[PDB]
Structure 1
C-alpha cells in the first residue's frame, strides 16, 4: 500500500519532530504540507485519490496541546479516531541509536486483539498502516527495526527498538482510542469507547469545581 501523513495548523516543535520521525519510519508514507481546515476532512480522500494511497493519516493539533489522529482508508469504510499522550522526541538520551531509513518493519501485539472486535479492527488497520511492501527504499538491509503495541488498561503503549539484546530507538507513544465511524471520513458513528475522557471535559470539571467553591465561599 501507499500512505499519507497529514498535520494541522497547530504546531509545537516537540510535537513536530514526531511527524518527521514517523515519515522517516514509513517510506511509502508521504509528508504533504499541513492542511488549513481541522474540520473539513472529506477533501483528504481526494488528496489520496490524487496520490493513490490506500490509507491516509491526519493529525489534529488543537490549542497546541491536544493531539488527535485519524487513520482511514480513503475510498473505504474504516475510520478510527485516537488520542495521543506522553510523547518523547529523538533529541534525548533515551534512544542512543539511529537506523537506515526504510528497512521492513517487524511488529508485535502485547495484547489479544481477538476477543474485542473493535480492538481487532484497530489491530488490522494498524497492520495495514505499518505494513511496508517491497517498494520501500533501503529495504534490502534488515536493521532489526521492530515495533510493539500494548494495551495497558485501554491505552496502547506503542514502542520501537533495535538490537545492541536491544536498545530503544524511536518515538514513545501512549495512545488512547476515542471512536470509530463509518465511511472514508464521514460515514455515521458506529462505536465509541466511553472510558475515554477528553481534556476539554477535564478543564471543564476543574472550572466547574472552582465556580462551585466560589459560590459556596
Structure 2
C-alpha cells in the first residue's frame, strides 16, 4: 500500500562530518536518491520529478559550522527548516551497529507530537519520509534496527538503536544522533506564505 521515495541533495560546503551523516542516512534509507550539488531554490522540485520522487531532503548550510535540513513533498507540499546544532556521525566507534542496510525501521513518537497541528504534521512527515515502504526495491525483510524520536524543550531529538536477543530482547544505541529545532514552515514546497515562525 504505502509507497514513497526520498531525494538527497547537499549544497556546497558540506563538511566531512555532514557528508558522512548524509551518506549513512542514505544507507539507512534504501528508497533514497543522491545528487551531486545545488546552487542558487524552486529547482529542487524539478529534480524530484525527474526521478518521480515523492520526497526531498535538502541539507542547507550558510556556514560550515551549523547544519540545516529541509523536509518537504516536492510536488506541492509544505517544507520545514531544521536548525540542527548537535551532530554525531556514523563513523563513531562508541556505537556498535550490525543493522541491515535498508531494513524496516520502527518509529517511536511521544505524546508531544499530537499536542499541536504542526507537531502532528512533522510526525506524519517523519513517518512517511523515513518509513521505508514494505515493498521498496532496496529494502530488506527482517527487522533489526529501530528509530527513536523524542521532543523536549521545543526541539526534537533523534536517536537510533539496534535490537538484540539472548538465549527477552535488548537494544544498543547505533547510528547518528542529533537535535533538530523547528525554525520555519512554508505552505508550499520551497515557497508560499510563511505559516509558522518561532
TM-score by length of 2: 0.89
Deviation of 1:93 after TM superposition, in Å, equals 2.5
Deviation of 1:140 after TM superposition, in Å, equals 4.0
9 and 109 in structure 1: CA distance in 2 versus 1, 3 angstrom threshold: same
| Larger relative helix fraction | 1
In 1: Cα distance, 2:129 partner to 2:93 partner: 28
Deviation of 1:145 after TM superposition, in Å, equals 1.0
Say if 1:6 and 1:58, in contact at 8 Å, map to a contact too: yes
Deviation of 1:167 after TM superposition, in Å, equals 0.8
- Residue 95 (structure 1) aligns with: 95
Deviation of 1:141 after TM superposition, in Å, equals 3.5
Deviation of 1:74 after TM superposition, in Å, equals 1.0
| Larger relative strand fraction | 2
Structure 2 residues without counterparts, runs of 5 or longer: 164-168
Deviation of 1:110 after TM superposition, in Å, equals 2.6
Deviation of 1:166 after TM superposition, in Å, equals 0.9
Say if 1:143 and 1:162, in contact at 8 Å, map to a contact too: no
77 and 136 in structure 1: CA distance in 2 versus 1, 3 angstrom threshold: closer
In 1: Cα distance, 2:36 partner to 2:140 partner: 29
Deviation of 1:142 after TM superposition, in Å, equals 1.8
Deviation of 1:174 after TM superposition, in Å, equals 0.9
TM-score by length of 1: 0.82
Please list the CA deviations of residues 181-206 of structure 1 after superposition, one character each: whole Å capped at 9, or x if unmatched: 111211111111xxxxxxxxxxxxxx
Give the match's secondary structure for 1:5.
strand
Structure 1 residues without counterparts, runs of 5 or longer: 193-216
Say if 2:146 and 2:160, in contact at 8 Å, map to a contact too: yes
92 and 140 in structure 1: CA distance in 2 versus 1, 3 angstrom threshold: closer
Deviation of 1:90 after TM superposition, in Å, equals 2.1
63 and 99 in structure 1: CA distance in 2 versus 1, 3 angstrom threshold: same
The alignment of Structure 1 onto Structure 2 pairs a total of residues equal to 190
